[PDB]
């Protein structure tokens, strides 16, 4: 029904843009889902991601998919404002999410109207399908998941990090190969139901 979403390569990067997309921050509640980072080596956008809500006036309330219990998620995802997921590895996200049932309960909340924050892995799966992201993050780490049809959430395919070093030639090759829509280090996608727009923080 509704759709609210903020979709980013690296929340620390447009956090101005996202205080320009939603109002009246102070004291609004995030479940902030870091399930995608912890299958990974490099991880200093986890801590920048939550200490930038932190500095708005977000209260940050951690659940890890990988872990929590459905009763848990099922809950946390209910009570809270927002809902934050942050870079990592795509298909572990995806895997985890599908296992838990929780893709579904991600969905009926943004349905509701609960505004989605997508960042790198968050952004890619709101696409129809990850396949496009396999040569930025490997499927090794995702032993279990056998189909690569996501959220859904719109038409197209977010490839982040785009024409950004390190990921200058990755996403280059992913264009060619593969709607494709790329946003930079510095976009933000703002999606408010049919109504999409790219902003550029410079």
């Known amino acids: 029904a509704m759709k609210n979403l903020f979709l980013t390569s690296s929340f620390k990067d447009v956090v101005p843009l996202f205080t320009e997309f939603e109002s009246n921050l102070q004291g609004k509640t995030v479940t902030f889902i870091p399930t995608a980072s912890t299958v990974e080596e490099v991880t200093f956008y986890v801590e920048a991601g939550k200490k930038a809500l932190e500095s708005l006036g977000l209260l940050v309330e951690e659940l890890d998919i990988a872990t929590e219990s459905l009763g848990e998620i099922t809950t946390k995802l209910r009570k809270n404002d927002f809902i934050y997921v942050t870079g990592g590895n795509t298909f572990f996200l995806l895997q985890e999410l599908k296992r838990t049932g929780a893709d579904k309960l991600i969905l009926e909340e943004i349905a509701a109207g609960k505004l989605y924050i997508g960042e790198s892995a968050g952004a890619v799966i709101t696409s129809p399908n990850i396949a496009y992201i396999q040569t930025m993050d490997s499927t090794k780490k995702a032993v279990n998941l056998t189909n690569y049809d996501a959220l859904n959430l719109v038409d197209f395919s ?29 976009e933000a ?11 550029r923080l410079s």
Not at 181 to 186: A, L, M, R, V, W
């Open 158 to 186: 977010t490839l982040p990090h785009y024409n950004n070093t390190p990921f200058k030639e990755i996403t280059q090759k992913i264009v060619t190969e593969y709607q494709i829509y790329p946003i930079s280090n510095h």
């Open 189 to 199: 996608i703002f999606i408010r139901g049919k109504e999409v727009i790219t902003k």
